[PDB]
Design a protein around this ligand. Structure first.
Ligand SMILES: Cc1ncc(COP(=O)(O)O)c(CN[C@@](C)(CCC(=O)O)C(=O)O)c1O
Ligand SMILES: Cc1ncc(COP(=O)(O)O)c(CN[C@@](C)(CCC(=O)O)C(=O)O)c1O
Lengths: 396, 396
């Protein structure tokens, strides 16, 4: 029976990592997967995380199953981070949160939930977007449509085309938005643009679904949540899939959350019971460790202060590398203007290189980037910057 | 969009956990969820596990993403446990293993893998069986069929009814088998019966799917795999979803595995690529903490020896409670023979109690059991045995 199965292509992102770990030539540079790296080029575990883990090792007395929706405090801390400490959504108990295995897991439970319990048939995603978005929703049998987003000429948000392309999104359709640090463009809407979309969203009857995987990597925790909060004060219902993989450096512990928001407490609890049914038929209940670490840190004022400082340092090192990248490209003789890179948010910048050049950089200079031209700026260091820019210039 | 969602019914297993937690009676007894308890009534963290976690805390340098299929060593160690150190499936490289979030997760990925890449239409499940089996397969869009298994009169396995029931399973159909410690009956096939089923399976043309969540709780590690090893030596293709939740006491860390077996190395790798795709669209990659603990314990002989002794103590304490249970029931006035309980394997015992009785035990005496009459013997201790048996006799 397994003879008739046709092989699957390699993940355009996770695959690259294997092709890199395979390359034998010295000096290789990995600018693929969106994982943070410090000045020495390593992905260390945060100090606040090592501390939390020591606390858990000493105080855990059992590994007994968590409830289907995970750790209670985890859900509470998540909601404050997203909506704000005094939020009315929280005070009116209009939101329920389930701890999930990563942001991906949050996206999948939301998709399964929507497919099995609502009349949702279509999800609208930006073009371009994280490749895995279409796969997650299709996995639940949901049709995925794309809306315009990037002005590749001015390296900015094509707001006019975005509005026009979403004209066909009907009431009941789900529209996916990146909370901040759009992947892979790094271009986010301004608060004014968010407000416009929020209004348009309510009038058209869309079900907003926010993917929040980089909160704190744009400007700050609270600032990066402004777009979501503009919608939240405007809508009756919405879904938010968030991830702690990057802002806590907990990639492999799979820590995320799927937050459901309904018109009132009675409706959300009812709907949430069906979300739990969906989780139960998938992985039963969430992994404890990653989420325990996060709940511990967010709950302890002393630990939280350290974490917030570590997040700030990562954010600043990236912005620092953004400026150094543009300066070195000039220094090394680039005639093309890359100034636009300074205006992008997060780990990824859309370089504007053609799939051809991207392959030439790899098989010829040993530099790895995603075929879309997306480069992980957080992977750049003072030590590989020069060879990197020298490679790019040579392929321009 | 959420106004008309109908509330979902509570899980017949995980639901009780919340009821029990809420009950105010100081003398409540929990015999519901299949979780091990020591003589003190606690669900401790194994010593082998605690030591392994100390190693990790001390030596982990990064939390960087694992890889769709997880830790390689983990995959190698579970195949040896399942097939045997010098198995032909291993040497001939016919097997691929993906690390999954618990056995439940392993079941869902296998289900998704099958529904999206093959012609499989329905899955055959024992009657009775773990309630979640139907939910997991129906969620992936697969039709579920039940085959006879338990003789409620003689409290034994009705091999005649089992074989006659399965004669209706067409080729290409999937048939689910519990590796050992059948849930909820506790009655497993003899090697001879396994021998037959294996032969009948190849001839009938079924795709065997083994659920192995209790290896080591029946007779022993190697011994409990006999049934599986019998099918392995005969079939070209098979799937095994295993769990480390119980034999390692790592319930909430979600540690499981899904092993794919094909005719040759080329076919399995081709098929496994789609399984990785199914995973990527679900939770992307697996949680590292639990799987890491298992890998290091199974890899270190000094640690391994400790773990194996701990598993033996757990298996033996359960056996001692099983005997104590039957003896105490007669002493407290049981007007019936519960000897059949001694013949059951695993953590449970199919008591024979009706739903109305189980219902009465909870509300009238605060003794919690599953509505099917399934009782967790691993939850019985020398201290709660008396009150527990008195309650049962009273509703008899
Ligand atoms: C928009 C976006 N949404 C959801 C996720 C899911 O994150 P999770 O917590 O790992 O499940 C990621 C991770 N993006 C990478 C940084 C990680 C690798 C990947 O593709 O999953 C990236 O390279 O894009 C995203 O960029
Ligand atoms: C046959 C069987 N299969 C799969 C699983 C899944 O295990 P996982 O690794 O936790 O995903 C369980 C756990 N059964 C319980 C011991 C746990 C509660 C539950 O229903 O999941 C039980 O009480 O049956 C099983 O009994």
């Amino acid at each position: 029976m397994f003879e008739n199965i046709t092989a699957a292509p390699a993940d355009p992102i996770l695959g690259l990592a294997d092709l890199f770990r395979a390359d034998e030539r010295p000096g290789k540079i990995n600018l693929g997967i969106g994982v943070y790296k410090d000045e020495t080029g390593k992905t260390p575990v945060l100090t606040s995380v090592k501390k939390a883990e020591q606390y858990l090792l000493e105080n855990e007395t059992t590994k007994n199953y968590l409830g289907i929706d995970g750790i209670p405090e985890f859900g509470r801390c998540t909601q404050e981070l997203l909506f704000g400490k005094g939020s009315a959504l929280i005070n009116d108990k209009r939101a329920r949160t389930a701890q999930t295995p990563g942001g991906t897991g949050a996206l999948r439970v939301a998709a399964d939930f929507l497919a099995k319990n609502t009349s949702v048939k279509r999800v609208w995603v930006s073009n371009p977007s994280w490749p895995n978005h279409k796969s997650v929703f299709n996995s639940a049998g949901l049709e995925v449509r794309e809306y315009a987003y990037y002005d590749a000429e001015n390296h900015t948000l094509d707001f006019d085309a975005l509005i026009n392309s979403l004209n066909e999104a009907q009431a009941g359709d789900v529209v996916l938005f990146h909370g901040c640090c759009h992947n892979p463009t790094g271009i986010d809407p301004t608060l004014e643009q968010w407000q416009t979309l929020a209004q348009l969203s309510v009038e058209k009857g869309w079900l907003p679904l926010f993917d929040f995987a980089y909160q704190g990597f744009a400007r700050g925790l609270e600032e990066d949540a402004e777009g979501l909060r503009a919608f939240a004060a405007m809508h009756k219902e919405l879904i938010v899939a968030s991830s702690y993989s990057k802002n806590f450096g907990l990639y492999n512990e799979r820590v995320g959350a799927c937050t459901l928001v309904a018109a009132d407490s009675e409706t959300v609890d009812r709907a949430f019971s069906q979300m739990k049914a969906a989780i139960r038929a998938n992985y039963s209940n969430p992994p404890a460790h990653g989420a325990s670490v996060v709940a511990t840190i967010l709950s302890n004022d002393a630990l939280r202060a350290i974490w917030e400082q570590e997040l700030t340092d990562m954010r600043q090192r990236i912005q620092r590398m953004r400026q150094l990248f543009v300066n070195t490209l000039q220094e090394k003789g680039a005639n093309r203007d890359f100034s636009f890179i300074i205006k992008q948010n997060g780990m990824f910048s859309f370089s504007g290189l053609t799939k051809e050049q991207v392959l030439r950089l790899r098989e010829e200079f040993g530099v790895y980037a995603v075929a879309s031209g997306r480069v992980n700026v957080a992977g750049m260091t003072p030590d590989n910057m020069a060879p990197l820019c020298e490679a790019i210039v040579a392929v321009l």
